[PDB]
């Protein structure tokens, strides 16, 4: 199905204590394949997925150089934005950046995106057409004007429509043995008495990939989305994910409830009754 390649960048200033902590990470769908950490010992772009090792020495020289260049830009922007928002040089401020591209089942370009944040709030982003910019406030505007005169959009577009995709296809090919796999969830349900007349039913979805999934409870076939507890999908740490949804039903009325599990690793959804 659809696939994407995404890079995540985080810079946090430490005025007076050290260089801003810079952390970049790369993903292909839900699999992280590379990482960099200005606090680490290698000071090189490092591998985080077996198949990335299929790359050659010039790959690591190149990605290390490019990633350091990113750190250098983020370092200047921390300063630049500080001035813009007229803030003290004492406090710690954060800059976040994300960008990447999506491809269909034929592995052809669907969409590209490049977003920038300052302290956890939109600052500026490349719109859908990949030719215009969305500025958050007055500050962003000044950057926007600067990025238009500089044709950053054109550069980002060339990368997002070409290079990004080209490489995504490439990693997809080398990672086929895994990236293109789909681990359907191993599901099960738990019935534990809660009150003297009520019972809690928890729907479990484990060991699945990608992380995308939907767990909805129904009563007599009607969605029950206002008496339930849903947990945020979470990483198992072994590549797969986990998630559970529970509802509080009158004891004796359990047979009326069913949990539906949607996951692309499944031919058709699953229905579960206690």
């Amino acid at each position: 199905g659809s696939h994407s390649m995404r890079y995540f960048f985080t810079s946090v200033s430490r005025p007076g204590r050290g260089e801003p902590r810079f952390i970049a990470v790369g993903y292909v769908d839900d699999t992280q394949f590379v990482r960099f950490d200005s606090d680490a010992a290698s000071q090189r772009m490092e591998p985080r997925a077996p198949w990335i090792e299929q790359e050659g020495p010039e790959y690591w020289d190149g990605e290390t150089r490019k990633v350091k260049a990113h750190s250098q830009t983020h370092r200047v922007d921390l300063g630049t934005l500080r001035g813009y928002y007229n803030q003290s040089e004492a406090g710690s401020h954060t800059v976040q950046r994300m960008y990447g591209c999506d491809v269909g089942s034929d592995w052809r370009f669907l969409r590209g995106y490049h977003q920038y944040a300052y302290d956890g709030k939109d600052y500026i982003a490349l719109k859908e057409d990949l030719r215009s910019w969305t500025a958050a406030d007055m500050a962003a505007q000044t950057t926007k004007h600067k990025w238009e005169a500089a044709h950053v959009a054109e550069q980002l577009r060339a990368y997002l429509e070409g290079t990004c995709v080209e490489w995504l296809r490439r990693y997809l090919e080398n990672g086929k043995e895994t990236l293109q796999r789909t681990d359907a969830p191993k599901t099960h349900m738990t019935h534990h008495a809660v009150s003297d007349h009520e019972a809690t039913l928890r729907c479990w979805a484990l060991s699945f990939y990608p992380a995308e999934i939907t767990l909805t409870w129904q009563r007599d076939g009607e969605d029950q989305t206002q008496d339930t507890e849903l947990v945020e999908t979470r990483p198992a740490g072994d590549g797969t994910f986990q998630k559970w949804a529970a509802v509080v039903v009158p004891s004796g009325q359990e047979q009326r409830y069913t949990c539906h599990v949607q996951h692309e690793g499944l031919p058709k959804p699953l229905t579960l009754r206690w």
């Binding site: 890079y7 260049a69 830009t73 922007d77 550069q155």
Partner: peptide
């Protein structure tokens, strides 16, 4: 593969 460079804001 990363962008060859990101322009300063």
């Amino acid at each position: 593969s990363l962008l060859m460079w990101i322009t300063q804001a």
